[PDB]
Structure 1
Amino acid sequence: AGAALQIPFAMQMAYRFNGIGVTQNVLYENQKLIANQFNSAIGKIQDSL
């Protein structure tokens, strides 16, 4: 939408949780589990491929 403006990635993930109706404390208080789940999900794609 213009020039790239940097933001830390967990803070971008919190904006995106807001965009679906969940408060952002739910992301910050679960950060490690959410990242573990994303990593297992990405590791399952290359296994199926």
Structure 2
Amino acid sequence: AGAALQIPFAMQMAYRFNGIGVTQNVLYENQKLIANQFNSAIGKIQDSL
């Protein structure tokens, strides 16, 4: 919607969780679990393909 604006990834995940009703407090205290789950899911989908 205009010019690109820099933003850290964690503060973008916080916004994206806040958008769907889950408060941003959940993300900043469960970051490693989310990262591990995402990596495992991407590995599984790569292997499935």
C-alpha distance in 1, partners of 2:25/2:2? 29
Q: Which runs of 5+ in 1 are unaligned?
A: none
If the length of structure 2 is used for normalisation, what is the TM-score? 0.95
Residue 38 of structure 1 deviates from its aligned partner by 0.6
Which of structure 1's runs of 4+ aligned residues deviate more than 3 A? none
Root-mean-square deviation (Å): 0.5
Could you say which structure has the greater relative contact order, defined with CA pairs below 8 angstroms and 6 or more residues apart? Answer: 1
Where 1:41 maps in the other structure, the secondary structure is helix
Please give the alpha-carbon distance, in whole angstroms, between the structure 2 residues aligned to 1:45 and 1:6.
Answer: 29
Partner of 1:45 in structure 2? 45
Unaligned runs of at least 5 residues, structure 2: none
Residue identity over aligned pairs, in percent, reads 100
TM-score, normalised to structure 1, is 0.95
